[PDB]
Amino acid sequence: TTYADFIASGRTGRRASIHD
Amino acid sequence: HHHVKEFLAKAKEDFLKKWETPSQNTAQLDQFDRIKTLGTGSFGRVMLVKHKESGNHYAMKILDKQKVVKLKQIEHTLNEKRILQAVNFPFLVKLEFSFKDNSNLYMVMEYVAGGEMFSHLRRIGRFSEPHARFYAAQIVLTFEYLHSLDLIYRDLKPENLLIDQQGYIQVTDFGFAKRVKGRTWTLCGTPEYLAPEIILSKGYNKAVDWWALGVLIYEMAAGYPPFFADQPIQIYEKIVSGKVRFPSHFSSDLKDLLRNLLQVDLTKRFGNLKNGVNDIKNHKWFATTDWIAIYQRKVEAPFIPKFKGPGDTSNFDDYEEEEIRVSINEKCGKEFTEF
């Protein structure tokens, strides 16, 4: 499921802001 | 409502006075006892502190001056403080004090013990539509307020939304906020929340905040963002394709609102049309929303964080603590003169 794919992904924790 | 229009004009006058003559140097470090780190970043951190003279708790953001300069974030940091000291709205975290010393910049914000929406959203999994709509309405009003002052926010995400004692939203982190008339170009934000025009380096305006609201509403209601992948580049590819799939449980009204906010075509995106924010406020998904009652905080919140004292940090994650160093030599004095 999409949810299972999200939860197995590397980006479920707090996400850093970026500047570039 | 001619009300809103006259509220906003008076709001702009108060804002402009403070914008033109900012407050500075309103406390000093030894007036606060530091208790616990609430969050970190590449050039600073936020600590829970207690003000000795009042006993009140605050969240103190501490920025290392040398690191801010090295990473070329002077203008962004000056933007943050100048904007924060000038704004006032029910759903914005308040700046209570600011000052600087030999090593650091300090912004002392009100403490919001309920923690980040992020933690609650990941724990619960997803919010029901009325629950998500309650928070979304607060963001709508807040962006209406900010954009009216020519401010662009540029970092909407659940990590930057704190839940207060009444269950209402408080927006924090004005690190990328900017006062701009016309176009701007800085690639900043969070990958999952970036509008297509930011990624494509074409110049962008406040419509990026409305795109971000679409992402936020989708993430609150689904439990995961509309565009995700293990690497930012793959996320960007998805964003610019603009193909969005919705969970089976999304209502028809929610899907239609999101198609209009997550519109890759700037010129067709809700919030950015002739009727501006009213296209969003008048949308069917918000038909049950009493906008005045929300502003006045008279709507019963769907969720109240459990509270065990001012100073409780249980709604926040643990971080590794470290010394606050203040050099005996002044660092970067000229760069931060106006702070």
DSSP B296-338: TT-SPPS------STT--TTS-----------SS--STTTTTT
Q: What is the CATH number of domain B1-21+116-306?
A: 1.10.510.10
Residue in this structure with the two tokens 């969240």, named with its chain if needed: B59
CA pair distance B211, B206, nearest whole angstrom: 9
3-state helix vs strand vs coil in chain B, percent to 5? 40, 15, 45
Residue B68, Cβ density class (10 Å: 0-12 exposed, 13-18 middle, ≥19 buried): buried
CATH superfamily of B22-115+307-337: Phosphorylase Kinase; domain 1 (3.30.200.20)
Alpha-carbon Rg for chain A, nearest whole angstrom, is 11
CA pair distance B175, B153, nearest whole angstrom: 9
CA pair distance B4, B255, nearest whole angstrom: 28
Residues of chain B with CATH 3.30.200.20: 22-115+307-337
Please, what is the Cα angle at B94 between B20 and B339, to 5 degrees? Answer: 45
Residue B39, marked binder: yes
Cβ(B302)–Cβ(B294) below 8 Å: no
Distance from CA of B225 to the nearest CA of A (A): 9
Q: Which candidate in B64, B155, B164, B279 is catalytic?
A: B155
CA pair distance B257, B280, nearest whole angstrom: 8
Q: Find the DSSP H helices in B149-246.
A: 196-199, 207-222, 232-241
Catalytic status, residue B155 = yes
Token pair for B243: 């193909």
Cβ(B79)–Cβ(B157) below 8 Å: no
Residues of chain B with CATH 1.10.510.10: 1-21+116-306
Cβ(A8)–Cβ(B178) below 8 Å: no
Q: Scanning every residue of chain A, which has its alpha carbon at the shortest distance from the alpha carbon of B222? A: A3
Cβ(B238)–Cβ(B229) below 8 Å: yes
Distance from CA of A1 to the nearest CA of B (A): 10
Burial B262-300, CB ≥16 within 10 A → b, else e? bbbebeebbbbeeebbebbbebebbeebebeebbeeebe
Cβ(B65)–Cβ(B78) below 8 Å: no
CA pair distance B47, B27, nearest whole angstrom: 16
Long-range contacts (CB closer than 8 Å, 24 or more residues apart) made by B47-52: B48/B111, B48/B311, B48/B313, B49/B108, B50/B311
Residues of B in contact with A15 (CB under 8 A): 157, 159, 190-192
CB contact (8 A) between residue B175 and residue A10: no
Distance from CA of A19 to the nearest CA of B (A): 4
Cβ(B190)–Cβ(A17) below 8 Å: yes
CB contact (8 A) between residue A19 and residue B245: no
Burial B32-57, CB ≥16 within 10 A → b, else e? beebebbbeeebbbbbbbbbeeeeeb
E-strand ranges in chain B read 32-40, 44-51, 57-64, 95-100, 104-110, 151-152, 161-163, 169-171, 178-179, 188-189
Instruction: Tell how many helices (H) and how many strands (E) occur in chain B.
Output: 11, 10
